[PDB]
Amino acid sequence: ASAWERFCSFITSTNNRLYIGWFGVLMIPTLLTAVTCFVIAFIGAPPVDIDGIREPVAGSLLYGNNIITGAVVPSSNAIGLHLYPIWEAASLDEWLYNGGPYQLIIFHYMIGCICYLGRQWEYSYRLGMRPWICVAYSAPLAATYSVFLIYPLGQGSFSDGMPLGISGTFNFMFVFQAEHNILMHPFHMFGVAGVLGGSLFAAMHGSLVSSTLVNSRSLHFFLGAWPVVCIWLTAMGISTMAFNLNGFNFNHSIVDSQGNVVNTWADVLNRANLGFEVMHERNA
Amino acid sequence: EYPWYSGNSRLEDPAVQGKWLAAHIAQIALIVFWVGLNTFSENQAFDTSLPMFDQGLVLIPHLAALGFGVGSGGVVTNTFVFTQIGAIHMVSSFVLFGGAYFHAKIGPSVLATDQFAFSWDDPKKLGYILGHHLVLIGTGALLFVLWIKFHGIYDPTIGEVRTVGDVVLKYGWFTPGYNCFFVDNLEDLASGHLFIGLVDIAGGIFHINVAPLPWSKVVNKYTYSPDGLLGTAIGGLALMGFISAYFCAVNTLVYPVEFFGPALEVKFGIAPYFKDTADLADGFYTSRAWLANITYYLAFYMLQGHLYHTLKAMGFKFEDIPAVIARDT
Amino acid sequence: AAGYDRATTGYGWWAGNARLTDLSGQLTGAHIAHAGMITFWAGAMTLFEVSHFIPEKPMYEQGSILLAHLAAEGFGVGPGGEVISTYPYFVIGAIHLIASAVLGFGGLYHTFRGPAKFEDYSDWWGYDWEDKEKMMQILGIHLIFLGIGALAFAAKAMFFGGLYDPWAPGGGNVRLITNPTWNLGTFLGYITRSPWGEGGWIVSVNNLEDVVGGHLLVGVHYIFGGVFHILVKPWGWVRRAYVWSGEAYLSYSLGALYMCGMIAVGYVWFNNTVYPSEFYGPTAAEASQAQAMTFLIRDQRLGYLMRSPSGEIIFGGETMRFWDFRGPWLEPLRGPNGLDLNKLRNDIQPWQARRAAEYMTHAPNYVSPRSWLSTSHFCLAFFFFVGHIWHSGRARAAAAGFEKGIERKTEYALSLPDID
Amino acid sequence: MQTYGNQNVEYGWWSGNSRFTDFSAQFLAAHIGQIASMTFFAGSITLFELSRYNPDIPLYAQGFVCLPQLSRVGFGVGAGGAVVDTYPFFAVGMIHLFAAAVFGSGAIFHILTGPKVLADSDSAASQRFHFEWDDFETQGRILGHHLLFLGSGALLFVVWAATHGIYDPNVGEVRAVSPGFDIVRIFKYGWATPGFNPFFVDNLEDVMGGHLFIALIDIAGGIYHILVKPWPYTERIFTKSGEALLGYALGGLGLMGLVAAYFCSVNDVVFPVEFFGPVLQPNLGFLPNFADTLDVSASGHTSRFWIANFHYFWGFYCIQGHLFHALRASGFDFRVLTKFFTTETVELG
Ligand code: CL7
Ligand SMILES: CC1=C(/C=C/C(C)=C/C=C/C(C)=C/C=C/C=C(C)/C=C/C=C(C)/C=C/C2=C[C@H](C)[C@H](O)CC2(C)C)C(C)(C)C[C@@H](O)C1
Ligand SMILES: CC1=C(/C=C/C(C)=C/C=C/C(C)=C/C=C/C=C(C)/C=C/C=C(C)/C=C/C2=C[C@H](C)[C@H](O)CC2(C)C)C(C)(C)C[C@@H](O)C1
Ligand SMILES: CC1=C(/C=C/C(C)=C/C=C/C(C)=C/C=C/C=C(C)/C=C/C=C(C)/C=C/C2=C[C@H](C)[C@H](O)CC2(C)C)C(C)(C)C[C@@H](O)C1
Ligand SMILES: [Fe+2]
């Protein structure tokens, strides 16, 4: 009953309402920090110079936006990959102006996510069950790390990271499509197949069980495995596109015998990408 | 019994003694074999035009110091002498290999003529062996003295080879006109070599003639043993290596700047070393630096090995070390 | 045959290798054969890239990655990143192919001919997983081999040809390092550097003296640590803080390899010193800054900079995100506070102005070697993280005993007090 | 040792050096090894400093503790504290290293020569060296011999200063010094009457006279202790145990360390300015410090700063160790401290 032993028996105990565990020891502060800062910076936060051009972009509720259009703007383009802690800032108002809250939120959130995976494993151990829920959870984890961490690393700044907002997500998707043509990348096709097929198999399994309940184990194995594998693949696809290894490109493929070019659907898709791109790229 | 990696410890057995002898013969052959082989490769890679202290020539400068193809200084006129010396050594190697094989598997397994046959605890035997080896060593020293008298070695101050007073009792006191590591006189070198040859021969005569005395059997607490004898020999070797490294680093009369490069500066980081004080190209070091540093560090690890063998010779066993660290977890 | 079926092992064919857990000889044979595979790939790819090499085009335009690794070490290269002769590459490839042949022979021999379980043949080679001392000693021996390898790399950099230093004057040049760094303050400053953009953890090394000194230091430490492992026992707390089985050791190795893979991606993508831009092409930062400088050169010839957030002189536009990037062709045009405009007015030597455009074209249609390496090894590192989790969980459960399912009649959750 | 009550105590490896307190041969071996370590430090550090010496930089600016000490005592220093010839320093360091090797060889010799106890060794003359932690006669003779060695060392210093000369910052160049002898002025330095303060000695002649006096005193005391058994009252006062003698020695050493620390920071003659740097000033915040009295900007700290501060700490913690060992040897066990917050009295012998 050493004080240290008593503490350990408290944390690694299956009688709390929510299991804490050693991974949860890191999970709780980081997640609480991320949630608190996200709430604060989503309700009210100054406009952020996303383009690093002294011109700001607002995203908070008190500055005009609603839930659909509000967001937490990524840290400024001038910062690059530099960590921007509050104590490493010239002035609080400036630190907000450069987009520090985004950095705070995403870093605490990513650490909390990986610790949450660890906590899942730990409790599976403490209860005496095979410890592979965490393996399945590793897929959406990979996806978030792709959009928030790996893509900015490949692109050199967190200004290319995903905004934390509903409309920011769509803006990110369209700019990503413009610059990398993700639709014609096979890994995203695997991901689309994964989500749609996962819904299909979920509906089929639920209908069958709820209809007759009024190797079969391999059935549930396949249920678990299919969408997880596809999400791993599409997360890897995003990560590869973060290193300028873009998808397929079939523009200007068929040419007339004399030398003219006959259009195909890929050219229409490329022209749509061209529109998205030229609307992007403020200057050149 | 010993494992294969420690296989040579099997030769420690007096049951198989002559084979042990074979090994030593082989070693010397290998040694003299290298003296040939190295030189040949050196003679291949030695450009005459360049200064001799730039390319990897260690033996060629040593020959250059002993005359052997030098005129008014900075003069190379015949690379055939170097090849001759290398060939002599390499041919002697074949003879020594023959003797090694004769004792290895043709000769008796154990010497037990019997006059050569000895035991690890026969002080008269070792005394006479020591005397004979000392006599040969002093003979080589006097041979070098004769070479000085007749052929004469390169001198930098004279700028040319030249042939040739015992104030050695003052050099030994390192009086400010001394510190032999700074000798600059051919006559000093010749006289000191005469003295050391004479003293070596006198000691050899004495050791063959007279058995070890009790007064000196008192101090030699444990050296009358294989490990003890090996340890004392290794310690002597390390001492000699340190002295030779210092000589090579500092002395310029014996090691001329022409073939060896300028003197070395003694520097110390965590461990000692010798720096060039020469504006050689980056990545290149004078032959003097190579000689001094490799010699010194070989001598340092010889000292470590002397400690190991000496400790094993006295009442100590190294395999007990983990067990101790087992008890005090 | 016996033991090669599901009934006699419990593992389906798709988990066949699991059967090898306690068959020491065959497992060793599999490892040796796999090493043979790796070195065979190395040699074969080297020979392929040599056979398709073209001296006029750069390596990164030509599309060779195994050749660039040798080029960095300076095997048959010249000043300014120019090959002299592709013979040493052929030498290396042939040596690797021969070594692969030997290793494959050894692997087949232990797989089929030799003893199945070394424990029967001898005891130094017979090992069981749950023997902590034996595993410690084997780890120590292999650590010693790694240390010898690292010291070998340092010795090559100091005596045998050296490395292609791209910070030599007038473009890169093959050099022999003579002044290795050994101050411990430098080493600590490297380790405790921020992994973030606030510097770079170890990826931020920019001179070859630090590289050579670091390899010296690590080789010394590896040899020492191997000796220590051979000579001592695992402490009590160490014995109580690990899992001791084959799968657990595999999981530890997987975690280490995942970490190394991520760090290698960081090196290949952010470093222009130990991956010279002459061979792997420009980094993303280098490409952006070269584009900015070439446009500035053209605009100054026909008749744009700005202030940093800290107030220095940097380029303008998107490239501000690479404001702190340091490069060999750009470093001479530096200043106490950012690249001075006056310096850019009349200090652009011809080779730097050629490198700027040559890098502007090849911004990572065309895919840089950096892109290939980075993407491939990020994917490999992620999957090795997943494997680390899988095997660590399996090891922990199997050691506990509940790996093959929950026990119907002694289920643990059924005994806990309800939380509500 | 102490072994409160229960004998045959078991010591962990952290306190493992108390195991050989009863093995005279091993005791000798340990102390010969320690002295080897000291002289090895002297020589090796001399070389380590010589490697990075800059004639341009003033000597005290660079971090040295040995070049100033050698240059003070003659050894290749020109007029105005100029290091003309840097070879004698090399010679001194080399002799120190050779001595260290000799001492270490002797240390291993004794650690492996014979029995752990020097009583059993059948040398029949090494048994002349076996001592006890109770007998004051043998320890008195030992003390006498060691005092003889110290007095011989002081004599050697006197001779070397008389013949070879020695640096004199007041003169400004190496110079032979006449050995003074004035018992009156020695005692006036003892009282620290206003003219003479011991830590402000101005003439090397006074220092030399005091050293002559010290040599005479040490040699006389050594003879006296070899010949004469301790008086009974010294058995009444002092306890007879090893840890007790360690405590006495530790107290003495702590005092000497504090004295030397104060000496370094203040005296300018025996610690010349050109070698060690300008004098320090003693400050007392929480703990005593020695302020450099010089702008540490672009000059680090003078060697005098380092010597003085290090030896203040050495002296202070030697005092604390003396208190610890005296408390143990008198009989006080510190385990009783754990009973502090209870109602049981925190007290025993
Ligand atoms: C992907 C996560 C993963 C990693 C990276 C990983 N393992 Mg395993 N792994 C093992 C070793 C191992 C080593 C030495 C090692 C590191 O080098 C790894 N692992 C690494 C063996 C001890 C043990 C037995 C493995 C065994 O017996 O056989 C392996 C089985 C198969 C089918 C191999 C075929 C591979 C797949 C077709 C993947 C295709 C990739 C593709 C070709 C790449 C090129 C692209 C192409 C399109 C051109 C093991 C298992 C197993 C699994 C599972 C699920 C894993 N793993 C998973 C991983 C067992 O059931 C199983 C297990 O433990 O059951 C008890
Ligand atoms: C006493 C003792 C022992 C130790 C015993 C040892 C190891 C004693 C050490 C003995 C040594 C190291 C003796 C060394 C002697 C060196 C000599 C005699 C040097 C001779 C050099 C000469 C004559 C040089 C000559 C020139 C040569 C050269 C050309 C110069 O240009 C000119 C000139 C003239 C200087 C043990 C081991 C027995 C036991 C110990 O416990 C105590
Ligand atoms: C044999 C044996 C073993 C023991 C084996 C051991 C411990 C062997 C020890 C081997 C060592 C440590 C050998 C040391 C060799 C020393 C060398 C190679 C010196 C190198 C110096 C060089 C290369 C020059 C370096 C410069 C080069 C240049 C001039 C610089 O400006 C300065 C300067 C001088 C440092 C075991 C343990 C394996 C098994 C036992 O049973 C038996
Ligand atoms: C009193 C007592 C005890 C205590 C006993 C102790 C500890 C007594 C303390 C004794 C001390 C502190 C003695 C110190 C003596 C100091 C001396 C003798 C100093 C000599 C210094 C000299 C000679 C300096 C010489 C020069 C050196 C220097 C150059 C100066 O510029 C000038 C010059 C030339 C004078 C107990 C506790 C042990 C037992 C109790 O019951 C009784
Ligand atoms: Fe279900």
Curated annotation (Swiss-Prot), chain A:
- Residues reported to bind chlorophyll a ChlzD1: 108
What are its E.C. numbers?
Answer: 1.10.3.9
Reaction catalyzed: 2 a plastoquinone + 4 hnu + 2 H2O = 2 a plastoquinol + O2
Q: What positions does the entry give for a quinone binding?
A: 205
Report residues binding chlorophyll a PD1.
Answer: 188
Instruction: Please give the InterPro entries that the UniProt record associates with this protein.
Output: D1/D2, Photo_II_D1/D2_sf, Photo_RC_L/M, Photo_RC_L/M_CS, PSII_D1
List locations, semicolon-separated. Cellular thylakoid membrane
Q: What is its main location?
A: membrane
Cofactor binding note: The D1/D2 heterodimer binds P680, chlorophylls that are the primary electron donor of PSII, and subsequent electron acceptors. It shares a non-heme iron and each subunit binds pheophytin, quinone, additional chlorophylls, carotenoids and lipids. D1 provides most of the ligands for the Mn4-Ca-O5 cluster of the oxygen-evolving complex (OEC). There is also a Cl(-1) ion associated with D1 and D2, which is required for oxygen evolution. The PSII complex binds additional chlorophylls, carotenoids and specific lipids.
Q: Which GO terms describe its biological process?
A: photosynthetic electron transport in photosystem II; response to herbicide
Q: Which residues bind pheophytin a?
A: 116
Q: How does it assemble?
A: PSII is composed of 1 copy each of membrane proteins PsbA, PsbB, PsbC, PsbD, PsbE, PsbF, PsbH, PsbI, PsbJ, PsbK, PsbL, PsbM, PsbT, PsbX, PsbY, PsbZ, Psb30/Ycf12, peripheral proteins PsbO, CyanoQ (PsbQ), PsbU, PsbV and a large number of cofactors. It forms dimeric complexes.
- Protein name listed in UniProt: Photosystem II protein D1 2
Species classification: Bacteria, Bacillati, Cyanobacteriota, Cyanophyceae, Acaryochloridales
